[PDB]
Design goal:
Chain B: Na(+) 1 binds at residue 61. Chain B: Na(+) 2 binds at residue 61. Chain B: The modification Phosphothreonine is found at residue 122. The structure is cut from a larger assembly and holds two copies of chain A. Chain A has helices spanning 4-12, 22-28, 47-53, 61-72, 76-80, 94-100, 104-112, 141-147. Chain A is mainly α. In chain A, α6 runs antiparallel to α7. The longest helix of chain A is centred in the middle third of the chain and has 12 residues, at 61-72. The radius of gyration of chain A is 15 Å and the shape is globular. Chain A binds chain B through residues 129, 131, 133-135, 148-149, and chain B through 142, 144, 148.
């Protein structure tokens, strides 16, 4: 069995083992990696997104496994494309983060598993400082990738 | 900020520049005024203070030039007054302006520091001098330079 907490901890330390029994779990319960219960109820963060924050050397293969699991249930598209919902990071996707981190490899990977390239990150974190701040590029992956000189 | 920085210049200007011009001005005015009192027998321009006040007007812009008739050897009195004006009204007043121009150039960055200091002292005191009433007591600065 797996609750939200269980996976998020596994992800935090790049553990691909504690997620050995993962796929077969939501096969029995037919639960989806995308269920309401597998996201933070106030931000909309998913395990893939936790993984995106918990990088070590711009690397995490909990990602590769996490994606793999989502296709086997074909949560695939809406999984890789889930966005933040809090006023701060609203509309931020994993692809936004990969770029923010200047990580070709993870941009490449996300685009190949079908990240929406037109997804607008539009929360207060992506507009001019309250100061909050900060910082605006606006919104769309291309725009980001240019404004950060990439 | 605009007015406060300006006030610093007035204070800076006053003591050093104004103070320096004042000494020489008192010295010149005193000497010449004494020379004049000796010169005049009668008519109330004899009194040192009275002559001195008449001598001051030259500096104000109200100088009378030949204020008093009742002096002897008249050409000398005029010579005394012309010399006082040349060295003292023109040479000094115009000099004071140039020297003021100097204090101003040197100060301004310094006078911004002084203004900054003055706000700090006023603020620090009110909180201490504000009863040390409940008040804040984390600093961070929003930053964004690349450098990336």
């Amino acid at each position: 069995l797996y609750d939200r907490r269980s996976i998020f901890d596994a992800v935090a330390q790049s553990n691909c083992q504690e997620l050995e029994s993962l796929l077969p779990f939501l096969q029995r319960s037919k639960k989806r990696l995308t269920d309401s219960e597998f996201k933070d109820p106030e931000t909309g963060k998913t395990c893939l997104l936790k993984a995106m924050l918990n990088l070590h050397n711009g690397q995490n293969d909990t990602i590769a496994l996490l994606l793999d699991v989502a296709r086997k249930t074909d949560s695939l598209k809406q999984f890789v494309n889930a966005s933040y919902t809090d006023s701060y990071y609203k509309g931020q996707t994993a692809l936004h983060i990969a770029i923010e981190r200047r990580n070709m490899t993870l941009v490449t990977l996300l685009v190949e598993n079908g990240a929406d390239v037109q997804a607008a990150a539009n929360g207060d974190f992506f507009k001019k400082t309250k100061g909050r701040p900060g910082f605006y590029f606006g919104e769309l992956p291309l725009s980001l990738a240019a404004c950060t000189n990439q | 900020q605009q007015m406060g920085i300006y006030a610093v210049m007035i204070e800076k200007m006053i003591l050093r520049d104004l103070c320096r011009f004042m000494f020489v001005y008192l010295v010149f005015l005193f000497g010449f005024s004494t020379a004049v009192v000796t010169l005049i027998e009668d008519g109330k321009y004899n009194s040192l203070y009275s002559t001195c006040l008449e001598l001051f007007k030259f500096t104000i812009g109200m100088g009378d030039l030949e204020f008093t008739e009742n002096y002897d050897f008249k050409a000398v009195f005029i010579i005394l007054l012309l010399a006082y004006v040349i060295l003292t009204y023109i040479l000094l007043l115009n000099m004071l302006i140039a020297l003021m121009g100097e204090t101003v150039n040197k100060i301004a960055q310094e006078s911004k520091n002084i203004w900054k200091l003055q706000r700090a002292i006023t603020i620090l005191d009110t909180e201490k001098s504000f009863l040390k009433c409940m008040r804040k007591a984390x600093x961070x600065x929003x930053x964004x330079x690349x450098x990336x």
